[PDB]
Amino acid sequence: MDIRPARISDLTGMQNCNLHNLPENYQLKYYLYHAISWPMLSYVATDPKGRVVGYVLAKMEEEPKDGIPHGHITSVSVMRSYRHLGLAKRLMVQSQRAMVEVYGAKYMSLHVRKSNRAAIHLYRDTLQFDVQGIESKYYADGEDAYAMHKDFS
Amino acid sequence: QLSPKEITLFRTALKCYETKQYKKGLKAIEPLLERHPEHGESLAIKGILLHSLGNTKEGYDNVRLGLRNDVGSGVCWHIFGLISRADKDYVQAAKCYINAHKLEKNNSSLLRDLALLQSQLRQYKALADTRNALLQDNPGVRANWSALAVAQFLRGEYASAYKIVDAFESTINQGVPVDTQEESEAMLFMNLVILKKDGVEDAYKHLLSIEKKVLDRVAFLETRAEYELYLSKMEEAKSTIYLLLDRNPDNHQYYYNLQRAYGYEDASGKVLDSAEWLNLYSQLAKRYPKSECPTRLPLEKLEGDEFLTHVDLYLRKKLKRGIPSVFVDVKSLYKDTKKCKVVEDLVSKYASSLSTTNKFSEDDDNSQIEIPTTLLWTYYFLAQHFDHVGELEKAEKYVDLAIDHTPTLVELFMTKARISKHKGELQTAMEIMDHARKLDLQDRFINGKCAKYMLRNDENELAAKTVSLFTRNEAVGGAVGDLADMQCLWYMLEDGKSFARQKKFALALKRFSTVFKIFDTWADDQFDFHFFAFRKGSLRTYLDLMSWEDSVYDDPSFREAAQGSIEIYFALFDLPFAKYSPKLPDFEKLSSGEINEEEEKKIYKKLKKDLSKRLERAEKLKEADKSRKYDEDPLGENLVATSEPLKEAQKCLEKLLPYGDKNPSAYILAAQLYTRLKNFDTASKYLEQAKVILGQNDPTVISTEKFYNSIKTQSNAA
Numbered sequence: 001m002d003i004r005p006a007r008i009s010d011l012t013g014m015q016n017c018n019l020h021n022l023p024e025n026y027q028l029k030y031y032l033y034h035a036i037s038w039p040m041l042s043y044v045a046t047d048p049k050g051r052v053v054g055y056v057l058a059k060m061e062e063e064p065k066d067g068i069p070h071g072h073i074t075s076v077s078v079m080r081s082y083r084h085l086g087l088a089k090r091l092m093v094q095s096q097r098a099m100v101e102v103y104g105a106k107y108m109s110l111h112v113r114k115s116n117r118a119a120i121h122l123y124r125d126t127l128q129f130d131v132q133g134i135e136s137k138y139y140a141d142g143e144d145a146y147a148m149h150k151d152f153s
Numbered sequence: 154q155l156s157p158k159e160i161t162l163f164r165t166a167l168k169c170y171e172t173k174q175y176k177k178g179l180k181a182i183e184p185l186l187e188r189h190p191e192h193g194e195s196l197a198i199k200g201i202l203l204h205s206l207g208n209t210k211e212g213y214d215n216v217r218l219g220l221r222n223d224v225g226s227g228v229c230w231h232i233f234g235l236i237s238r239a240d241k242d243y244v245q246a247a248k249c250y251i252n253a254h255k256l257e258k259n260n261s262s263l264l265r266d267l268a269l270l271q272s273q274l275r276q277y278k279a280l281a282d283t284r285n286a287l288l289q290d291n292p293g294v295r296a297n298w299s300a301l302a303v304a305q306f307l308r309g310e311y312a313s314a315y316k317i318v319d320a321f322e323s324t325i326n327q328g329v330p331v332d333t334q335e336e337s338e339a340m341l342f343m344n345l346v347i348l349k350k351d352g353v354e355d356a357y358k359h360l361l362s363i364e365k366k367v368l369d370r371v372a373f374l375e376t377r378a379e380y381e382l383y384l385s386k387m388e389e390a391k392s393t394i395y396l397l398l399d400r401n402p403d404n405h406q407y408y409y410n411l412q413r414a415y416g417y418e419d420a421s422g423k424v425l426d427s428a429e430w431l432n433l434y435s436q437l438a439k440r441y442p443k444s445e446c447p448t449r450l451p452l453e454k455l456e457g458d459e460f461l462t463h464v465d466l467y468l469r470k471k472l473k474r475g476i477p478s479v480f481v482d483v484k485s486l487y488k489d490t491k492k493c494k495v496v497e498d499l500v501s502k503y504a505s506s507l508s509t510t511n512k513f514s515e516d517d518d519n520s521q522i523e524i525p526t527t528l529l530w531t532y533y534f535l536a537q538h539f540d541h542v543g544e545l546e547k548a549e550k551y552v553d554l555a556i557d558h559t560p561t562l563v564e565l566f567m568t569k570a571r572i573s574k575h576k577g578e579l580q581t582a583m584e585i586m587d588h589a590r591k592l593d594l595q596d597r598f599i600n601g602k603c604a605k606y607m608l609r610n611d612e613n614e615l616a617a618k619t620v621s622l623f624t625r626n627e628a629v630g631g632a633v634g635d636l637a638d639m640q641c642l643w644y645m646l647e648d649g650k651s652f653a654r655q656k657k658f659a660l661a662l663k664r665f666s667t668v669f670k671i672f673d674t675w676a677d678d679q680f681d682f683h684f685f686a687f688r689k690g691s692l693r694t695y696l697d698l699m700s701w702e703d704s705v706y707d708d709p710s711f712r713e714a715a716q717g718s719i720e721i722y723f724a725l726f727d728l729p730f731a732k733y734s735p736k737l738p739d740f741e742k743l744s745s746g747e748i749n750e751e752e753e754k755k756i757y758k759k760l761k762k763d764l765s766k767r768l769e770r771a772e773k774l775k776e777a778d779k780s781r782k783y784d785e786d787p788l789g790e791n792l793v794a795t796s797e798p799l800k801e802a803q804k805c806l807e808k809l810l811p812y813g814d815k816n817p818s819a820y821i822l823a824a825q826l827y828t829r830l831k832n833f834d835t836a837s838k839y840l841e842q843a844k845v846i847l848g849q850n851d852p853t854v855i856s857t858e859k860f861y862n863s864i865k866t867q868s869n870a871a
């Protein structure tokens with residue numbers, strides 16, 4: 001229930017939260033890579049015992065499209081127990097603010113599989129994302145991915 | 154030495170190494186070396202190529218023979234440092250780079266690499282000297298300045314760090330960018346230097362001066378509030394913290410800080426102004442109601458009648474909304490066990506109110522309205538509650554009430570499975586969990602929990618099939634092979650512990666060794682950031698990375714895997730039949746020693762043949778990995794066949810001991826280890842250390858000492 005900027009010490013906790021609800025995983029060095037390259041972009045939700053419950057792994061695009069800077073959500077999830085609370089929405093708005101203020105991001109982007117109803121309903125409806133397009137067989141299982149964009153204007 | 158024709162080939166040998174594909178380079182080395190074996194540098198280039206593709210000591214032999222032949226040459230030392238760093242032997246690699254640089258002082262790249270090794274080995278003394286020599290080589294780049302200041306900051310020399318940052322910052326009078334992000338992060342680091350040297354007073358003044366330069370708005374404001382609270386500037390902290398709540402009113406520490414600024418709360422406990430303390434939180438309800446903190450946070454410190462009033466409104470609030478997480482939220486309030494009864498009796502009354510009416514209690518019928526589905530979440534709360542309290546009879550009765558109402562809800566079956574687990578019945582617990590998974594096939598979470606309960610019931614293969622649904626099954630040992638690559642700690646631990654109680658030691662040792670490998674990887678992952686962090690200029694973050702890695706092996710997961718490995722290594726030493734990983738029925742027959750020599754020989758003949766079949770199976774697996782480079786030699790049997798399990802147990806104990814004061818079990822295991830090693834003075838001291846903490850009446854202490862007395866008096870004879 002405590003949301004806050006992510007630290008180095010809670011990176012492994014984010015990885016665990018990712019290994020629990022996503023198919024869709026990276027090794028810790030890539031989390032380390034996010035912390036060092038963009039230290040204030042990632043946020044974390046925490047249970048009373050100090051363990052990571054939800055998170056948002058955020059970054060700025062290393063190779064920007066057309067030269068305009070923009071943010072990218074690489075991963076976000078909440079443990080099944082703590083869902084339907086507002087944790088994800090609140091994690092996103094904190095990370096979004098940091099993208100704009102620190103890095104001057106003109107927009108933000110992510111990928112979602114077409115069959116994920118909870119995710120789409122989160123971005124397109126409550127977070128006001130637009131569907132930029134569809135990427136064929138983006139995921140390992142061959143499922144198509146919606147490319148979502150939120151323009152800041 | 155000195156030939157014109159061989160030079161063109163000697164260079165192609167090196168160029169081929171840089172471009173990888175080491176087969177071509179070796180082709181340029183061989184013709185020259187067979188007729189000139191005494192060239193040191195030459196043997197070395199042959200070695201690293203034979204090392205680079207592999208494998209492995211074939212290279213080391215050519216390297217070491219070449220390094221002995223040329224005393225003498227920085228080329229031989231540089232390459233020896235390369236293969237050492239490649240093989241993760243850092244103390245040896247660092248010693249190679251210093252010798253490589255002593256022979257070639259004008260080569261700065263060696264120092265650039267050396268600093269990485271010295272940062273990894275946490276040699277702050279030599280690191281500073283190296284970062285300094287690099288700064289003198291290229292004072293132009295900002296990174297080399299930060300690297301020296303940070304290295305000096307880590308040594309505790311804050312003053313020297315201050316001069317370095319201040320010297321550089323003055324060399325740019327025009328600007329402002331630069332990066333503007335490097336500048337922002339550098340200033341925060343400079344403010345950290347000042348705070349660590351000139352105290353909080355100076356650090357606060359400096360922070361206010363650099364406000365225009367800091368891009369990270371949260372980092373600034375949080376650091377400001379920490380300072381303003383320390384200097385007892387309450388009116389300033391009051392407003393600053395308010396800026397933080399505006400940005401993120403879900404951050405608990407902000408409320409604890411705002412309360413402290415008003416003086417309604419001390420640095421530790423909340424004293425006093427208990428009336429105005431609530432009043433603040435009531436005004437914090439004006440902070441847009443989208444935040445639950447103003448109502449929830451006081452529930453921690455409230456008591457008596459005012460707690461009952463607020464916990465009632467809070468519970469009703471989440472019950473009417475139908476939040477499944479309602480118990481997990483309130484759950485932490487049970488720390489005092491008095492509120493536990495209060496909450497228990499309150500929601501028990503919620504249960505029988507919804508009986509005749511649809512409204513809570515009695516007097517709520519005067520305020521009318523009604524609720525249709527609240528009985529579910531009341532039942533579900535009570536189901537979770539009594540399971541936590543440990544009733545299990547009352548608990549299971551409630552889930553059934555919830556399931557009878559709505560059979561399609563997954564969470565209801567999650568709790569019921571837990572209760573069966575607490576009842577000691579694992580088989581039915583596993584089945585219920587699988588039924589819950591069947592209710593959601595697209596959710597990896599419910600799938601993972603299902604595999605866990607399968608593991609707890611010692612169905613390893615059934616669990617592997619279950620996780621095979623959500624894993625990338627391309628290459629290495631299936632779903633489980635992928636779970637190891639993704640550093641999934643819980644599965645390797647649960648799988649290994651399962652093999653452990655099934656007396657399958659080879660596989661248990663395998664799973665535990667993977668946890669070892671995961672932690673070794675995490676410890677090693679920081680290596681590249683001893684360079685990259687100064688390129689991005691994330692200084693305060695790099696500091697956290699360094700301090701995190703220092704205690705990285707102090708973890709429940711590593712402890713459990715190390716403890717489990719040592720326990721199995723003890724069994725390998727004690728029982729001669731443990732190496733064959735006997736089946737549980739076969740394990741108990743040989744452990745009882747009541748069987749005759751006729752039956753005993755029969756079991757061993759079977760156990761050996763079955764081992765051979767596993768060994769034969771392992772080879773087919775290795776052939777599979779190879780054809781698909783780095784393979785895996787131990788498919789699980791290599792560990793359990795160790796010549797001395799005591800040594801391996803001793804290795805596993807290495808990273809346990811430094812944290813042994815907070816985890817006295819490490820001292821106990823140590824005592825048990827050296828007792829078997831016939832080294833009693835080293836065994837007794839560890840036993841004594843474990844006796845100081847938690848000891849005297851402790852069961853694990855007396856059983857170890859009893860074991861200690863049995864072996865020590867057995868060293869002699871009477």
Ligand SMILES: CC(=O)SCCNC(=O)CCNC(=O)[C@H](O)C(C)(C)COP(=O)(O)OP(=O)(O)OC[C@H]1O[C@@H](n2cnc3c(N)ncnc32)[C@H](O)[C@@H]1OP(=O)(O)O
Nearest residue numbers: 021074075076077078083084085086087088089110118119
């Ligand atoms: C780039 C990313 O990796 S894309 C893929 C994201 N990862 C996953 O989906 C993994 C598994 N799922 C989850 O972890 C979570 O369900 C998340 C991250 C999708 C949502 O997080 P939550 O905290 O539970 O949702 P949150 O409460 O913050 O957001 C609110 C909205 O989410 C929507 N929502 C959340 N879960 C669901 C659901 N199961 N069904 C329908 N809608 C849902 C609601 O519409 C809700 O709107 P509301 O304001 O009217 O209540």
Ligand SMILES: [Cl-]
Nearest residue numbers: 029030031033
């Ligand atoms: Cl990386």
Ligand SMILES: [Cl-]
Nearest residue numbers: 047049051484
């Ligand atoms: Cl727990």
Ligand SMILES: [Cl-]
Nearest residue numbers: 046049050051
């Ligand atoms: Cl925390």
Ligand SMILES: [Cl-]
Nearest residue numbers: 060061062103
């Ligand atoms: Cl960037």
Ligand SMILES: [Cl-]
Nearest residue numbers: 061062072074
């Ligand atoms: Cl990307």
Ligand SMILES: [Cl-]
Nearest residue numbers: 089093126127
């Ligand atoms: Cl919103």
Ligand SMILES: [Cl-]
Nearest residue numbers: 277278308309
């Ligand atoms: Cl020192």
Ligand SMILES: [Cl-]
Nearest residue numbers: 298299321339
């Ligand atoms: Cl600097």
Ligand SMILES: [Cl-]
Nearest residue numbers: 309310311312
């Ligand atoms: Cl000093």
Ligand SMILES: [Cl-]
Nearest residue numbers: 409410413420
């Ligand atoms: Cl405080």
Ligand SMILES: [Cl-]
Nearest residue numbers: 456457458460
């Ligand atoms: Cl009370």
Ligand SMILES: [Cl-]
Nearest residue numbers: 571574602605
């Ligand atoms: Cl559990």
Ligand SMILES: [Cl-]
Nearest residue numbers: 019020601641
């Ligand atoms: Cl998993």
Ligand SMILES: [Cl-]
Nearest residue numbers: 579608609610
């Ligand atoms: Cl068990």
Ligand SMILES: [Cl-]
Nearest residue numbers: 272300304683
């Ligand atoms: Cl360094």
